[PDB]
Write a protein that holds these residues in place. Structure first.
Motif, PDB file in Angstrom:
ATOM      1  N   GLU A   1       0.812  -1.205   0.000  1.00  0.00           N
ATOM      2  CA  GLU A   1       0.000   0.000   0.000  1.00  0.00           C
ATOM      3  C   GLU A   1       0.851   1.262   0.000  1.00  0.00           C
TER       4      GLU A   1
ATOM      5  N   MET B   1      -6.146  -6.261  -8.487  1.00  0.00           N
ATOM      6  CA  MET B   1      -7.052  -5.610  -9.452  1.00  0.00           C
ATOM      7  C   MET B   1      -6.880  -6.088 -10.915  1.00  0.00           C
TER       8      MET B   1
ATOM      9  N   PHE C   1     -12.628   5.808   5.902  1.00  0.00           N
ATOM     10  CA  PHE C   1     -11.606   4.863   5.466  1.00  0.00           C
ATOM     11  C   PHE C   1     -11.165   5.208   4.039  1.00  0.00           C
ATOM     12  N   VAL C   2      -9.862   5.150   3.765  1.00  0.00           N
ATOM     13  CA  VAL C   2      -9.362   5.413   2.410  1.00  0.00           C
ATOM     14  C   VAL C   2      -9.223   4.033   1.778  1.00  0.00           C
ATOM     15  N   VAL C   3      -9.974   3.706   0.714  1.00  0.00           N
ATOM     16  CA  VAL C   3      -9.884   2.374   0.056  1.00  0.00           C
ATOM     17  C   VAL C   3      -8.437   2.063  -0.454  1.00  0.00           C
ATOM     18  N   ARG C   4      -7.861   0.930  -0.009  1.00  0.00           N
ATOM     19  CA  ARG C   4      -6.497   0.541  -0.355  1.00  0.00           C
ATOM     20  C   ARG C   4      -6.345  -0.218  -1.687  1.00  0.00           C
ATOM     21  N   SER C   5      -5.125  -0.185  -2.261  1.00  0.00           N
ATOM     22  CA  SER C   5      -4.798  -0.876  -3.513  1.00  0.00           C
ATOM     23  C   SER C   5      -5.169  -2.351  -3.487  1.00  0.00           C
TER      24      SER C   5
ATOM     25  N   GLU D   1      -7.378  -3.873  -1.646  1.00  0.00           N
ATOM     26  CA  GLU D   1      -8.757  -3.971  -1.205  1.00  0.00           C
ATOM     27  C   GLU D   1      -9.765  -3.963  -2.358  1.00  0.00           C
TER      28      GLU D   1
ATOM     29  N   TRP E   1     -10.734   2.723  -5.575  1.00  0.00           N
ATOM     30  CA  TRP E   1      -9.392   2.751  -4.981  1.00  0.00           C
ATOM     31  C   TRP E   1      -8.969   4.229  -4.745  1.00  0.00           C
TER      32      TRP E   1
END
Ligand code: A1A3S
Ligand code: A1A3S
Ligand code: A1A3S
Ligand code: A1A3S
Lengths: 265, 264
Positions: free
Chosen positions: A38, A185, B14-18, B20, B78
Motif C-alpha cells: 500500500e 485488481m 476509510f481510504v480504500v487501499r490498492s 482492497e 481505490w
C-alpha cells in the motif's frame, strides 16, 4: 501520507485494524506485507505514475518481484499507529530495489525493515530482460543517487542464497488454492498470498510459542487462479529456522522457495 | 473515528487501499464487510467495552451473528474516502441488531447500507438463550430508544426467509479450507471468510458482467480451523442466486444465503 521534503521517499501512517491481528493481538506478517504494498503504491502515484513509464508501457514491460525480505522487531498492537517510509534505488541493469522502514509512531523507534528485488519482464511473453538505459534514466529522477539501504550490514540475511528443500519434507500443507480475495485488481495472485501459503506448513506449536522475526522469499513462477499449491517446510536449526518450498500440487513445479527465523516468546 | 454528538452512534472514514479492490478498481464486498466489522469494534471500544459486559463475562456469554445483510449502490473506488455510521438496537428478548450506513465522503450520498442480527450464546457449551433480564439494561444506555432502522421498508429484503438448496447444485466450488489469515484474534474463522466462500461458486462470467447488489447470509454453524467446506449455488431468476455452504464430508450445513446481481 506524503512525499518527504526532498521528494525521494514517501511516508504513511496506518492504524492497525481489529481483523488485521493474530492471537497475540498484534499485526500479522501478512498485514505488514499488505501495508508495505500500500505505501509502495501511494509512493508511485505521488510521483506521477498512472508503476510503469510511457516507454515501458509502449514496450509492454512490467516490474515483477524476484525476492522479498522482512525483519520485524516488534509487531504493532491492535489500535497502534505505525509509520512506514519507502524509497526505490536503481541497481544498474540488474533491476531495482524498494526498501521500507517501519517505526512506532509514539516512540519513533524502528520496529521493522524490509527490502525487495525487482526485475523487468515482458507482460505477455513473461520473458526477463536487463533494465535498458532509456528506461533507467526515466526512473533515476525519483530515487536517491547515494546508496540508501534498509539492510546496510556486511553479510546480512537479505542477500543469502536459498537452497531447494529435498523430499521428504518434515511438515506439509496440501491442496492450497487461491480464492477471489487473494487476487489483485489485474486478476493475478497477490504477492502476500504466497507468504501466507509458506507459513501454512509451520506447526501451530511454533506459532503459539514463537514470534516470526525474519522471512526471505524468492519468487520463481506465478501461481495462476486455477492452480493448486503444496506448502513444504523442514526445520534447519533459542531460535528456530525453517526451509520452505511451494510447488504445484500435481507435477511439483516450484513456484517459491524461502526461509524463516523465529524467536522464542 | 468518533461517537456522534448524542453518543448513540459511531462514525469512521476509510481510504480504500490498492489490495482492497477487485477487477473494476472498486472495493470488494469482502473489503466492505471487513470495514463494517472494524467500525463496529471501534464503536464498542469508544463506549467502554474492553463487546461483552461484566455480567456477560461472569456468565461466559458472547454475542454471535445469526444473519448479515448488505446492500451496495456504488462501491468506492481505490483511493476514495468512504464514511460509515453504525449503531445498535435492542430487539427485546430475541437479541440485538447492529446497522450501518455507508456514504461517499465527497458527495454525502448514501452508497450502501447493512444490518446484522445477533443472539447471546454460552461460549463453552455453544447453547443459545434470549436476553438474560439484567443484560438488556446494561446495553440499552448505548442504543437509541426510538426505532432507527437502516432498512425501514415493511418486510424488505433483509427479513426474507432463506430456503435450503436442493441437490444437484447448478454450480459448485469444493474443498475450500481456512488459512491463518482467515482466523480472528481468538482463532475463530472470521465472519467475512464465509461471504468469500459463498461467492466462490458464482461463475466468473457473472462477476465480469454484473455487480453484486444484495447479499443476505444466515450463519448456522461455525467452520472450525480443521474443517473443509463445499460452496453450492443455483440460479433462481437482474440475476438472483441461492447459496449453501456445507462441510465437505458429511454435508452438515454451516451457512445458507442469497445474492442479487445488477447487469453492468
Ligand atoms: C513485493 N510487494 C509488492 C509491492 O511492494 N508493491 C506492489 C505494487 C508496486 C509497489 C508496491 S509485496 C509487499 O509482496 O506486496
Ligand atoms: C520497482 N519500482 C518502480 C520504481 O523504481 N519507481 C516507481 C515510483 C517510485 C520510484 C521509482 S516499484 C516497487 O515497482 O514501484
Ligand atoms: C457480523 N460482522 C461482525 C461485526 O460486525 N462485528 C464483530 C465484532 C463486534 C462488532 C463488529 S461481520 C461485518 O460479518 O464481521
Ligand atoms: C450486538 N452488539 C453489542 C451491543 O449491543 N452493543 C455493545 C457495543 C455498542 C453498544 C451496543 S455488537 C455488534 O456485538 O457490538
Amino acid at each position: 501520507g506524503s512525499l518527504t521534503e526532498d521528494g525521494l521517499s514517501y511516508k504513511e501512517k496506518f492504524v492497525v485494524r481489529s481483523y488485521e491481528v493474530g492471537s497475540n493481538k498484534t499485526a500479522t506478517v501478512e498485514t505488514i506485507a499488505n501495508l508495505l504494498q500500500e505505501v509502495g503504491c501511494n509512493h508511485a502515484q505521488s510521483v506521477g505514475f498512472s508503476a510503469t513509464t510511457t516507454t515501458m508501457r509502449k514496450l509492454h514491460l512490467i516490474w515483477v518481484t524476484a525476492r522479498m525480505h522482512i525483519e520485524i522487531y516488534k509487531y504493532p498492537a491492535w489500535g497502534d499507529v505505525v509509520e512506514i517510509e519507502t524509497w526505490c534505488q536503481s541497481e544498474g541493469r540488474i533491476g531495482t530495489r524498494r526498501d521500507w522502514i517501519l517505526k512506532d509512531s509514539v516512540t519513533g523507534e524502528v520496529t521493522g525493515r524490509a527490502t525487495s528485488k525487482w526485475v523487468m519482464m515482458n507482460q505477455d511473453t513473461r520473458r526477463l530482460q536487463k533494465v535498458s538505459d532509456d528506461v533507467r534514466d526515466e526512473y533515476l529522477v525519483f530515487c536517491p543517487q547515494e546508496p540508501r539501504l534498509a539492510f546496510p550490514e556486511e553479510n546480512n540475511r537479505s542477500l543469502k542464497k536459498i537452497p531447494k528443500l529435498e523430499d521428504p519434507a518434515q511438515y506439509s500443507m496440501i491442496g492450497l488454492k487461491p480464492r477471489r480475495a487473494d487476487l489483485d485488481m489485474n486478476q493475478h495472485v497477490n504477492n502476500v498470498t504466497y507468504i501466507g501459503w509458506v507459513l501454512e506448513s509451520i506447526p501451530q506449536e511454533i506459532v503459539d510459542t514463537h514470534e516470526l522475526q525474519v522471512i526471505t522469499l524468492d519468487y520463481r513462477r506465478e501461481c495462476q487462479q486455477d492452480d493448486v499449491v503444496d506448502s513444504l517446510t523442514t526445520t534447519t536449526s533459542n531460535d528456530s529456522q525453517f526451509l520452505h518450498l511451494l510447488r504445484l500440487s500435481g507435477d511439483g513445479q516450484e513456484i517459491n522457495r524461502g526461509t524463516t527465523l523465529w524467536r522464542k516468546k
